[PDB]
């Protein structure tokens, strides 16, 4: 049950481009790509603790 | 109702597809309403008469208005001896035969209705395709951002038809005026004189003189030139909306677009079915490059 991640990234860059999210066009795609490539090297990279994953009372530094 | 609504939407959608005209919702529903009332009138007059179906021999007679309302039942005393079940089935099948006859009449009447309706759409429909700018391309011709591509195959097979005379315009109005010129020409001539004293003549003047209708008598009192609604040359509902509020403009625009799309999809379905029936098309997609490769 793990699909391939290309459609997802081309989509998520597409949205930020068609939404007006960034003043300069590339920034959307670059940031989204970069942030993934850095996490690729991390132990258990694609899983996250449920509490620290997002906005919650206590957070990470 | 249905057959009519399909065609009316065909007209509305085509109206905005080809030229930038929108038909007022008011208008669109009033067309339909007229078909409806037509049918209603036909019902009014259809209930004044009766249809007789009959079962076994003439033993079982059923008298019923074409709408299917049951009026009288005559029965041989022979039936009285059967069973309640068979009595029931017998009268029931007589009733069915009545409904058959009535429904035959009715369907003739309906064909009549459809014809009047078409005739009434004709100034609009023709109104869109009889313009100096109206055109179509073959459906199988690829379409790209700039314009439409040539379909390659069988350079004989593609013939462009033209509705309009290319030299100076001859409109339907001119043709009706021609008709009344020949009417008066025939009338005013000898041998058109003696014909106007015949029964044929007075029949003709009965039906087709409006000018002779006494004041207050029903029907048109002049002869009317055919309606002219040239589509690209007449602003309809988009002009009022574009002045008043942009939001309603965008929404009516939207509707016309959606209807057009829907119509086109239906035409694709009928096409597909017709293609499977003759066995040129399979029952599941076998060619996915015709879809996925864009």
């Amino acid at each position: 049950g793990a699909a391939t991640r290309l459609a997802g990234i081309s989509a998520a860059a597409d949205v930020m481009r068609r939404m007006g999210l960034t003043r300069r066009p590339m920034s959307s795609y670059f940031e989204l790509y970069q942030r993934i490539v850095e996490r690729s090297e991390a132990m258990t990279p694609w899983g996250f603790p449920p509490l620290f994953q997002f906005e919650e009372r206590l957070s990470l530094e | 109702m249905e057959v009519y609504r399909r065609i009316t939407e065909r007209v509305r959608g085509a109206l905005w597809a080809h030229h930038g005209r929108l038909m007022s919702e008011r208008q669109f529903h009033r067309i339909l309403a007229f078909v409806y009332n037509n049918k209603y009138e036909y019902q009014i007059r259809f209930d004044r008469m009766e249809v007789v179906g009959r079962e076994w021999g003439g033993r079982v007679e059923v008298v019923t208005t074409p709408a299917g309302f049951l009026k009288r039942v005559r029965v041989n005393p022979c039936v009285e001896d059967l069973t309640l079940y068979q009595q029931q089935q017998l009268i029931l099948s007589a009733y069915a035969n009545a409904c058959a006859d009535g429904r035959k009449l009715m369907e003739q009447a309906e064909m009549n209705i459809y014809k009047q309706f078409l005739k009434d759409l004709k100034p609009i429909v023709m109104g869109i395709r009889d313009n100096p700018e109206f055109y179509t391309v073959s459906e199988n011709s690829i379409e790209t951002i700039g314009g439409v591509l040539q379909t390659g195959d069988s350079n004989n097979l593609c013939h462009t038809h033209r509705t309009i005379p290319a030299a100076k315009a001859r409109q339907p109005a001119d043709e009706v005026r021609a008709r009344q010129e020949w009417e008066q020409k025939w009338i005013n001539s000898p041998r058109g004189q003696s014909w106007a004293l015949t029964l044929r003549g007075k029949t003709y003047f009965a039906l087709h003189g409006p000018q002779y209708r006494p004041r207050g008598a029903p029907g048109a009192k002049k002869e009317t030139l055919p309606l002219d609604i040239p589509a690209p040359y007449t602003a309809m509902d988009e002009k009022r909306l574009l002045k008043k509020n942009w939001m309603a403009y965008l929404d009516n625009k939207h509707v016309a677009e959606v209807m057009w799309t829907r119509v086109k999809i239906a035409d694709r379905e009928k096409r597909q079915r017709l293609l499977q029936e003759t066995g040129r098309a399979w029952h599941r997609p076998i060619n996915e490059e015709a879809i996925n490769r864009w």
Binding site: - | Y40, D47, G68, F69, L70
Partner: protein, 50 residues
């Protein structure tokens, strides 16, 4: 606050689908809303005439 079942309308629905009418006036007259006398009493209470 009554909550009807989904098919609640079925009886009436087959009664309507199967109705037949001698002429069209009978089909839709203004007063087919009314059967018992109670109805005739509530529909005209206002005109002291009728």
């Amino acid at each position: 606050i009554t909550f009807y079942s989904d098919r609640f309308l079925f009886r009436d629905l087959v009664n309507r689908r199967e109705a037949s009418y001698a002429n069209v006036w009978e089909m839709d007259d203004p007063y087919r809303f009314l059967q018992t006398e109670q109805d005739y009493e509530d529909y005209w209470g206002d005109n002291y005439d009728v």
